[PDB]
Paper text:
As an example, the [name] protein PatA and the [name] protein [name] are required in Gram-negative bacteria for peptidoglycan O-acetylation. The overall structure of [name] reveals a central fold that is typical of the Rossman-like [name] hydrolase family.
All three forms of the enzyme were active as O-acetylesterases and had similar kinetic parameters when rates of activity were measured with p-nitrophenyl acetate (pNP-Ac) as donor substrate. Repeated efforts to crystallize full-length CjPatB or CjPatBΔ31 were unsuccessful, but we were able to crystallize both CjPatBΔ113 and a truncated form of N. gonorrhoeae [name] we had previously characterized (herein named NgPatBΔ100). The corresponding homologous residues in CjPatB are Ser138-His310-Asp307. However, we observed that the highly conserved signature Gly residue of typical [name] hydrolases in the block II sequence motif is replaced with Ser161 in NgPatB and Asn165 in CjPatB. Structurally, this results in a type I β-turn of the peptide backbone at this location, in contrast to the typical type II β-turn found in most other enzymes of this family.
Residue numbers in the entry: 115 to 328
Write the structure that this text describes.
Amino acid sequence: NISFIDNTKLELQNGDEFLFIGDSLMQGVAIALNRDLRNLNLKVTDLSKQNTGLSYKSYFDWSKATNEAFIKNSNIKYLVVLLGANDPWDIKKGGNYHRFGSLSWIDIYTSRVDEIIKIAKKHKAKVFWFEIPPVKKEDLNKKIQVLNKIYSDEILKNKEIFINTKLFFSVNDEYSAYIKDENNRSIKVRTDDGVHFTPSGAREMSKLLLEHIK
Ligand SMILES: [Cl-]
């Protein structure tokens, strides 16, 4: 249900910059997170890109894109990651076929997650990795939880930071388009496709990252 609750708070160092990577979920969170980090005099490079994921690595390789971004800017010391909504499907590699959630599939996906973390560590950067919050479609939601377990396990092993989102975007342990705001009033945080964020939802995601910074 919940692997662990991450209470880590990072102290930010002068001149250090942020890099965002991920899919259209990160694009939506990025709008809010950029504004919040801008307000703290922090520079942001936002590479988030629609229709990407670790499972689509042959179409767009986030490990290559991330490595190149660090190469172009030695001042990036914080990597923020939110992806996976496009990823929970069988993977074919040549004649080899890997059914989603099978042991070999998990090996491949875990390796792709680890590659991202190792690239940040090689460039002396720390990693904030968002848990994908629940989604409305039951079948997709079940698969997303497999992804989130992998992210959390890899982040734990590499001693980076995992941003818990499941509780904050759930009501009575299930998906909800609405949550309570800071004053206990109901606010719409998910768009009607049951996946993406409203502006208020994006700000709530951004707040969860900011709660891992001091
Ligand atoms: Cl997307």
